[PDB]
Write a protein that binds this ligand. Sequence first.
Ligand code: HEC
Ligand code: HEM
Ligand code: HEM
Lengths: 102, 240, 32, 380, 51, 68, 77, 60
Amino acid sequence: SSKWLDGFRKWYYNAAGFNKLGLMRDDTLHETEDVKEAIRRLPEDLYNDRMFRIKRALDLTMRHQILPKDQWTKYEEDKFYLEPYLKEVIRERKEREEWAKK
Amino acid sequence: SDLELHPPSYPWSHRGLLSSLDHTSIRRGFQVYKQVCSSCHSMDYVAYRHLVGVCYTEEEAKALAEEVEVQDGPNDDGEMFMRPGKLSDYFPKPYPNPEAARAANNGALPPDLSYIVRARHGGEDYVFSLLTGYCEPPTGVSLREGLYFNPYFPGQAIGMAPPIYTEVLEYDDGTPATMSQVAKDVATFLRWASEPEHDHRKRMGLKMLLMMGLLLPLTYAMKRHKWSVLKSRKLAYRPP
Amino acid sequence: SHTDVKVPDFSDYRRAEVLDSTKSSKESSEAR
Amino acid sequence: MTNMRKTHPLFKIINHSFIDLPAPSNISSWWNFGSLLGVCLMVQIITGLFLAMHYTSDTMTAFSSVTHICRDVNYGWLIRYMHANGASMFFICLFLHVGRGLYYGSYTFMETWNIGVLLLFAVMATAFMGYVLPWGQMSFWGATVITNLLSAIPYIGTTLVEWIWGGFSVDKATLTRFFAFHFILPFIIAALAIVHLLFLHETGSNNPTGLNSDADKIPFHPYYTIKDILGILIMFLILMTLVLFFPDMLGDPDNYMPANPLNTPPHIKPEWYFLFAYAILRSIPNKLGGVLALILSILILALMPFLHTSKQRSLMFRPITQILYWILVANLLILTWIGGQPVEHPFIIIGQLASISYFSIILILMPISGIIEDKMLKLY
Amino acid sequence: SRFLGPRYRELARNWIPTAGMWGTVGAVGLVWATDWRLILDWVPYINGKFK
Amino acid sequence: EELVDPLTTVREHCEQLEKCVKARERLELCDNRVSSRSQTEEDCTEELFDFLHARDHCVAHKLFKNLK
Amino acid sequence: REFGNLARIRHVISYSLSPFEQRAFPSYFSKGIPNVLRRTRERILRVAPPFVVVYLIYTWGNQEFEQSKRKNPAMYE
Amino acid sequence: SPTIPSRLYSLLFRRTSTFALTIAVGALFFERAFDQGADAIYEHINEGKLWKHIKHKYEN
Ligand code: HEC
Ligand code: HEM
Ligand code: HEM
């Protein structure tokens, strides 16, 4: 059912390890051209939050430590902030590719 | 057969990481090589000048170099003459070419024992096991004459007669010249001939370990001192 | 405000000679 | 008054490349291996320069010249075993360099990765010809093995092996030209390393998290200066204990015999860093198939950046691909071992399954793992 | 599917003659540089030098 | 002949060690097996190698204190 | 590319102390051993079992090879 | 209350030139002292096995 899939996704979310550094999935997305377009399309507060989270993750990796378990981000609170911007950028790129093909 | 018998790990006096060779044992092994092994084997990369400084005095090395006659030349009219050897001369060939060695040794070629320890699996353990491992062949192993059964030799049919036994030579130190004593001495000598830089290399390694046990905590302390600015750095985020 | 900016406590990393806030410096700086 | 460090042209190039270089603040000890490779290259250049100062590339005098270096030249034994154990350390640092690049997603620097692959080929050729150089039994026989394996190519192989041999077998001309090539090729390696560093500095350096490291960057000096100095000291510790205590466990005893064309060795094997390629070439039972398998197994590193099917760069947050990568490293260890023992039972099936699993993991399994990993993280 | 389309198909169709002529250039240069017998023992003049 | 061999004293003591006793038992079993048959190609090199491995291992533990 | 214009960061404060005033090994063992144990705990399940099966098939291959070199008592009839 | 590192800094570790002089003199004296100590450790480990230990039997 969906409950077992959600539980196994929770276990994978704990096993991935970016929640221990305070990161998010959109924070740990690799920066391609479309991703960079999404970050440049981000608003100011979300940009500052993302860059501070990345800086704190880099500091923690430098010290070879993680955040306390209280300060780990949760799977329910992982905001998918870059998803609409990324989807719009992919849609525009696919439109451009279709126009170039036709 | 196709099997190999692994020589066992003998407790040599130089097997430790900071243990040198027994130079008296190298002396006795050189005497064993000169009086027994030199009739068939060659040691062309070792000289009396290599011998002096680790086993013999310069006068003793000169005496045992001049006790053998070497071929030299040419002279004024162009003729190969014979002169007593010197320190710079190497150990003399028992055969001029390897084909003569094969002819005089029933086809088998006695290898040069200047790198035999570094060139055989086991090294001095293999040499000791080969010299003290001669035994009667088991049932079903028919060996033609000129070959001797030796379990430690690959192929088990060596072309070597048993070279050493009890009272095969006389030592100048009064040491009993038993089979095991002679084999241990000649194995120590062959290890020295394979690695003349043995004790010097061990001294280098001892100095290197003392020096690096000094340097590594201190260099690590310098690295942690330079990196202490970052490893204790605190980050704060204050959006308005 | 910038006045709320306070340097956090560093006693978990700081040396023993300057661990006291009331004790002056420049008497252990040469030693360190 | 002017700032000489960033005003003088050579000084400002050095400052912009090595001194004031913005480096990621969180790169671990795995990032010391590039400088370890450079220091190993310099050590090899110096030690081989002295070895060639006392070395003659004649078939009659190669082995006697090596013995003369070991015994008669002052600390020539130290120079020679520093050279050999530095080759072992060079390949250790190369393998850990490539492992860092595969694990932390550094192959996305495509041109830097390709220059690195060309460097890996050049270093392998250099070390092969250098191992041929002392004219030992295993050196000569391994040279014959590798040249015949190259001669397996149809319609081109016989002419190419006669051209490289300088004759009909490994002989005087082969040894002398191998000495010339082994002398010259590390300088081509050094120039390609300048190209490597130039492309890397164009693209910037990569952090273990795989994120954008421009938020937190530190100058290279003095942080990574002292970190690389500590790494150099540790690498010298391992190299010097390898030279001064265990100088022959990574070498081969059969190389201490003169090269006899009439007598074969009991078991012919190449050096330990060629063993995985030797094992896969033994695994595929075709000469052309074996040499093509070797060539493709080294070119597949250049083929690697087109296999990235994940939206995460490094494997830090990719546990399934982490498991697959560690199985890949384990399989490389199995391949080195199988190149160790000869081609018998059950080494036939072990080497065959090791090669098939190695290729399957590096081609098929890792992108599928990345795809299902993205699906599990709900990316599409 | 980026390179699969009608505009790319007709661009490729324009570039077939040029790529084929470049391949002919490379083939002729390879035969001339290597002195390949299997090709050079069919042209009339160059047959003379091989005897 | 007058000077007894420390080598052979250690050898006979390692024969008195019981693992080598079992090895010699297999050796005599192989010897009678091969000898009580004609037209065979079986040799006793396997059992001899096992016995020699065990006995020379015992010797390598317990020989060089008797030498100079 | 240069050190002055790499990224845009706002409202972020960094605090650092002098290396001559803070220790180089601040409790090197007391919070050093638990950190190493935590790192090993996080990354021991993904690393160890591959080398475990290396050891297993290494031992199995050597045992099978030695059994192959061992003679088979089946030549009598 | 002036300690030994404090005197070392106030005398030798302050200026770079006298710092380098301290490094050079310490390098000379430590080279001699370390060579003597490591050599003595080597002799004590290998008593009765070296040529410098056994030459008195075979000389004069
Ligand atoms: C003439 C009777 C010899 C005497 C005296 C010594 N050796 Fe010899 N040796 C001789 C021959 C004809 C051979 C070749 C046998 C063969 O089957 O190859 C050898 C060989 C060796 C070897 C090499 C064994 C190997 O596996 O390669 C060694 C290590 C060896 N011999 C040792 C050795 C020593 C130490 C001697 C002095 C006590 C000695 N041999 C004397 C011929 C003769
Ligand atoms: C003689 C050979 C080589 C030299 C001198 C060399 C040099 C370097 C140096 C100095 C660095 C920077 C330090 C570091 O990141 O470790 C580096 C990084 C890198 N090397 Fe190499 N390298 C060599 C071979 C290779 C090989 C064989 C590969 C891959 C197959 C490779 C690919 C890379 C990549 C991708 C990086 C970037 C890593 C990152 O950005 O984090 N190089 N190299
Ligand atoms: C300018 C650079 C170099 C020069 C001049 C040089 C020169 C030499 C010489 C003269 C020898 C013969 C000495 C001997 O056989 O021991 C040799 C051997 C060897 N070289 Fe180099 N070399 C250089 C760089 C390298 C590099 C970069 C590698 C490997 C990455 C390498 C690997 C080897 C090996 C493995 C041997 C065999 C040593 C042995 O078998 O004992 N060399 N080299």
